[PDB]
Amino acid sequence: PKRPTTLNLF
Amino acid sequence: NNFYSVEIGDSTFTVLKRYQNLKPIGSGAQGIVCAAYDAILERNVAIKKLSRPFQNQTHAKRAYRELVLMKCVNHKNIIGLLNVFTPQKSLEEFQDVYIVMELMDANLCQVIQMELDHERMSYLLYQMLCGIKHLHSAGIIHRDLKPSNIVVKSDCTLKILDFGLARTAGTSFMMEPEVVTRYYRAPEVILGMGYKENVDLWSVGCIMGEMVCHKILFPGRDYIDQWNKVIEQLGTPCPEFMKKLQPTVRTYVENRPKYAGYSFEKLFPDVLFPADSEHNKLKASQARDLLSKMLVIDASKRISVDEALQHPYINVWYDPSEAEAPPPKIPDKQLDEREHTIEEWKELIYKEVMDLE
Ligand SMILES: CCOc1nc(NC(=O)Cc2cc(OC)c(Br)cc2OC)cc(N)c1C#N
Numbered sequence: 547p548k549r550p551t552t553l554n555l556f
Numbered sequence: 557n558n559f560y561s562v563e564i565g566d567s568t569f570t571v572l573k574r575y576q577n578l579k580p581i582g583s584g585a586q587g588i589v590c591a592a593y594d595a596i597l598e599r600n601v602a603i604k605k606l607s608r609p610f611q612n613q614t615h616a617k618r619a620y621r622e623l624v625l626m627k628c629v630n631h632k633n634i635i636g637l638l639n640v641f642t643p644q645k646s647l648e649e650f651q652d653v654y655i656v657m658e659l660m661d662a663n664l665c666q667v668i669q670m671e672l673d674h675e676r677m678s679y680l681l682y683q684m685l686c687g688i689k690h691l692h693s694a695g696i697i698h699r700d701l702k703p704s705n706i707v708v709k710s711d712c713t714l715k716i717l718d719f720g721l722a723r724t725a726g727t728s729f730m731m732e733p734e735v736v737t738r739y740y741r742a743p744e745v746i747l748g749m750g751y752k753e754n755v756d757l758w759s760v761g762c763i764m765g766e767m768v769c770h771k772i773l774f775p776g777r778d779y780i781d782q783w784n785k786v787i788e789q790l791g792t793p794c795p796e797f798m799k800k801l802q803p804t805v806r807t808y809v810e811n812r813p814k815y816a817g818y819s820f821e822k823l824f825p826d827v828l829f830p831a832d833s834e835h836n837k838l839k840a841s842q843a844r845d846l847l848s849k850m851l852v853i854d855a856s857k858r859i860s861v862d863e864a865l866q867h868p869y870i871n872v873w874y875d876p877s878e879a880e881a882p883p884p885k886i887p888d889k890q891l892d893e894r895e896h897t898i899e900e901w902k903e904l905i906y907k908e909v910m911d912l913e
Contacts, residue, residue: 549679553712
């Protein structure tokens with residue numbers, strides 16, 4: 547599955 | 557001498573030249589904080605000045621605790637130190653202390669206000685969750701988790717924060733705990749009961765519901781209505797519970813009008829949840845069942861950290877190296893049931909900086 551590594555902080 | 561005066565808002569900053577270009581990012585519950593550049597290291601770091609620390613037996617105990625705790629806690633989710641210094645030379649000269657620490661991209665109060673997805677939200681919950689588990693793994697409760705105190709990186713990391721209160725359950729209540737944010741104050745706090753490692757989870761509860769609802773769970777217009785608001789949502793507490801609350805409070809809390817309480821199946825519809833459709837363990841009903849076990853009035857029936865991490869929604873990110881992580885060991889000087897003078901917190905606090913650099 548593996549965790550994500552993003553997060554559009556705008 | 558080698559520091560410089562940075563005209564910031566009110567009290568002016570006298571930080572090393574290492575730190576340049578200071579802008580304000582916030583003002584915690586101690587001093588203030590800026591997001592400056594630390595050339596010497598190459599990366600933006602947060603400098604926190606506790607202008608005049610030892611004003612009284614309060615801003616001096618929350619400090620010595622903040623100090624030690626800062627240097628003792630190391631974890632992927634629990635923010636780390638970096639540097640601590642005092643612009644003053646002599647033993648007497650001392651009257652201020654600056655703290656340099658890491659610096660993310662934003663604070664949770666930025667995610668709260670955005671439409672996450674599942675794998676993600678569950679990761680932060682896990683993320684934030686673990687850090688908590690860790691901190692507890694030393695008998696240390698934070699008692700203040702709230703967006704204003706949670707930070708997520710663009711790479712989707714995340715860190716706890718402000719160890720200004722986070723103490724250990726050694727003493728009980730106080731009819732002056734008004735310092736810990738209302739909307740995130742737990743029943744055992746509100747009702748002046750007596751906290752344990754759990755309390756922190758409730759915070760985490762009023763969090764998720766915020767990462768889901770977008771509104772704050774239980775508003776409150778005074779510490780006394782807070783209750784009249786939490787219970788209006790989760791129903792009036794089970795009689796046994798009553799027997800727990802102190803004598804007085806019991807009477808009042810008992811007089812309150814009776815409330816049915818709503819099932820979390822309505823408190824958080826299937827709609828307020830990230831597209832429920834992927835990787836089993838996840839699923840909306842799990843994000844909820846999670847809450848279902850955190851948002852709990854009776855403190856003794858609230859899903860503790862472990863079981864949380866050990867929960868269908870969270871669990872999928874487990875990994876002993878960052879959960880069952882080594883316990884952040886404490887020396888043998890910390891005092892939670894002991895106080896001194898200000899000229900003593902000085903010696904102590906001053907002798908608690910110096911060496912550091
Ligand atoms: C508000 C609490 O203070 C603190 N806040 C942080 N916060 C961050 O690094 C995230 C962050 C980054 C920003 O872009 C540069 C801005 Br703009 C604000 C902001 O969030 C506030 C880190 C800390 N170590 C302390 C402390 N102490």
